[PDB]
Paper text:
Heat Shock Protein 70s (HSP70s) are a family of molecular chaperones with diverse functions, including directly assisting in the correct folding of nascent polypeptides, preventing protein aggregation and aiding the translocation of newly folded proteins to their correct location in the cell. HSP70s interact with almost all newly synthesized, partially folded proteins and are able to recognize such a diverse range of proteins by interacting with short motifs of five amino acids, enriched with hydrophobic residues, which are found in practically all polypeptides. Heat Shock Protein 70s (HSP70s) are key molecular chaperones that are overexpressed in many cancers and often associated with metastasis and poor prognosis. A surface plasmon resonance (SPR) fragment screen designed to detect secondary binding sites in HSP70 led to the identification by X-ray crystallography of a cryptic binding site in the nucleotide-binding domain (NBD) of HSP70 adjacent to the ATP-binding site.
Seven fragments with similar SPR responses to wild-type HSC70-NBD and the S275W mutant were assessed by soaking into HSP72-NBD crystals, and a single hit (1) was found to be bound to the protein. The structure of 1-HSP72-NBD revealed the fragment bound in a new secondary binding site located adjacent to the ATP-binding site. This site has not been described before and is not present in the currently reported apo or nucleotide-bound crystal structures of HSP70 isoforms. The cryptic binding pocket results from movements of the C-terminal subdomain comprising residues D225–L305 relative to the N-terminal subdomains. In particular, the α-helix N256–S277 that lines the nucleotide-binding cleft moves closer to the N-terminal domain than in nucleotide-bound structures, and residues G339–N360 move further away from the helix N256–S277, forming the binding pocket for 1. The new pocket consists of an extended narrow tunnel with a mix of hydrophobic and hydrophilic amino acids, in contrast to the larger and more hydrophilic ATP-binding site. The lipophilic 4-phenylthiazole motif of 1 forms mainly hydrophobic interactions with the protein and extends into the canonical nucleotide-binding site, with one single direct hydrogen bond between the compound and the side chain of S340, and additional indirect interactions with G201, K271, S340, R342 and D366 mediated by three water molecules. The binding of 1 in the new secondary site necessitates that the α-helix N256-S277 moves out of position relative to the opposite face of the nucleotide-binding cleft and twists the section from K271–S277, displacing the key S275 residue from the orientation required for a productive interaction with a nucleotide. Thus, when 1 binds to HSP72, the ATP-binding site is disrupted, and we expected that the two binding events would not be possible at the same time.
Numbering used by the authors: 2 to 383
The structure:
């Protein structure tokens, strides 16, 4: 029997693994039934937890639960991005020769890990999710990275794959993987200008690619760091901080424990809106023992975040300028990230593109892994 290769979207907050088998891509769910797995690792006196198990115990173990390794990978410790991010993380980041390492307690001792070691643990979990589905060990993979990652970040991501025991067939960028998922590199002769609009993940990104005889050229990349998934969560947090003020007469904004528990509920409620018109928030003993039970409607979420959705258009206009292309020169518009599922986000982009239709047939939370899986099958078939 021949071994299939997997495609891995190694995400900032969630990772996704796919495998192409017999003409179709299967996005593989993990052992908790989740088609995406938190890019989290936690350490205890006896265990190293990865994915859902690590994320689900973050509230009581914040110093030894690592996340956001993608924000450190391939960077120098003195990078002002690293220094600003360190102020928000509850886990320790140390400087070892101008390279960051995360330091935690694990098995009764202090241990430090390079970002590519934390990402290799996430990769090992993705590998195991695929091996449980396929029933044999998986070692060939295509791993994706953002188009704006430099050579240091791409090489460090490849190193995480090597540490996880994977043969990294290729490192491809996330917008290229999305275009491959839709087969936009297989439309025959003639160039195709593709715009990839990625909203909902760790960072909002707009990229423009030109595909010519199967060859991809990145013409432009634009975005907004304050349009990541966390900024949508924080908008929901501020809204519920005001609701708790009106209902219980207390201001919880300066209580770290209360704000963190509310942020976890908000992030899950936000995602729950993909399958339901209304998501319930049930937080026991949120602040001073007061239970906070509420809900968020899709209608409210859309109005609350209207300005954030509108803030995505200026980066699209800037990417079109950098690429030296008119809106009418774009053949395909591709949606990536959970927020692109919202018909109001789709309407904003469709109207901006003068009525052009958008590609949304592949679940935007899965499109990057879907494309990485297709590319992995193509390289393994070769
Ligand atoms: N950021 C993120 O992951 N999410 C944002 C909030 N969600 C919403 N989905 C909708 C929605 C979905 C399908 C049909 C109509 C409406 C409305 S608000 C889910 C995705
Ligand atoms: Mg992503």
């Amino acid at each position: 029997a021949k071994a299939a290769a997997i495609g891995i979207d190694l995400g900032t907050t969630y990772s996704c693994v796919g495998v192409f088998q017999h003409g179709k891509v299967e996005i593989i769910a993990n052992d908790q039934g989740n088609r995406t797995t938190p890019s989290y690792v936690a350490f205890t006196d006896t265990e190293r937890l990865i994915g859902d198990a690590a994320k689900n115990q973050v509230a009581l173990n914040p110093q030894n639960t690592v996340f956001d390794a993608k924000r450190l990978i391939g960077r120098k410790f003195g990078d002002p991005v690293v220094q600003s991010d360190m102020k928000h993380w509850p886990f320790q980041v140390i400087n070892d020769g101008d390279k960051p390492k995360v330091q935690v307690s694990y098995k009764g001792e202090t241990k430090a890990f390079y970002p590519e070691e934390i990402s290799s643990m996430v990769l090992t979990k993705m590998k195991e999710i695929a091996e449980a589905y396929l029933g044999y060990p998986v070692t060939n993979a295509v791993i994706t990275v953002p188009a704006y990652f430099n050579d240091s970040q791409r090489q460090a991501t490849k190193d995480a794959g090597v540490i996880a025991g994977l043969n990294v067939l290729r490192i491809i960028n996330e917008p290229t993987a999305a275009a491959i998922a839709y087969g936009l590199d297989r439309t025959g002769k003639g160039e195709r200008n593709v715009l990839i609009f990625d909203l909902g993940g760790g960072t909002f990104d707009v990229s423009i690619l030109t595909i010519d005889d199967g060859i991809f050229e990145v013409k432009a990349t634009a975005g907004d760091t304050h349009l990541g998934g966390e900024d949508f969560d924080n908008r929901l947090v501020n809204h519920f901080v005001e609701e708790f003020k009106r209902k219980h007469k207390k201001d919880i904004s300066q209580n770290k424990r209360a704000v963190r528990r509310l942020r976890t509920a908000c992030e899950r409620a936000k995602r729950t809106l993909s399958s339901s018109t209304q998501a319930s928030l049930e937080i026991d003993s949120l602040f001073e023992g007061i239970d906070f039970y509420t809900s968020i409607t899709r209608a409210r979420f859309e109005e609350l975040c209207s300005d954030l959705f509108r803030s995505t258009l200026e980066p699209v206009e800037k990417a079109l300028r950098d690429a030296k292309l008119d809106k009418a020169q774009i053949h395909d518009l591709v949606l990536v990230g959970g927020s692109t599922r919202i018909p109001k986000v789709q309407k904003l982009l469709q109207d901006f593109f003068n009525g052009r239709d958008l590609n949304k047939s592949i679940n935007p939370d899965e499109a990057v892994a879907y494309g990485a899986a297709v590319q992995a099958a193509i390289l393994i078939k070769s």
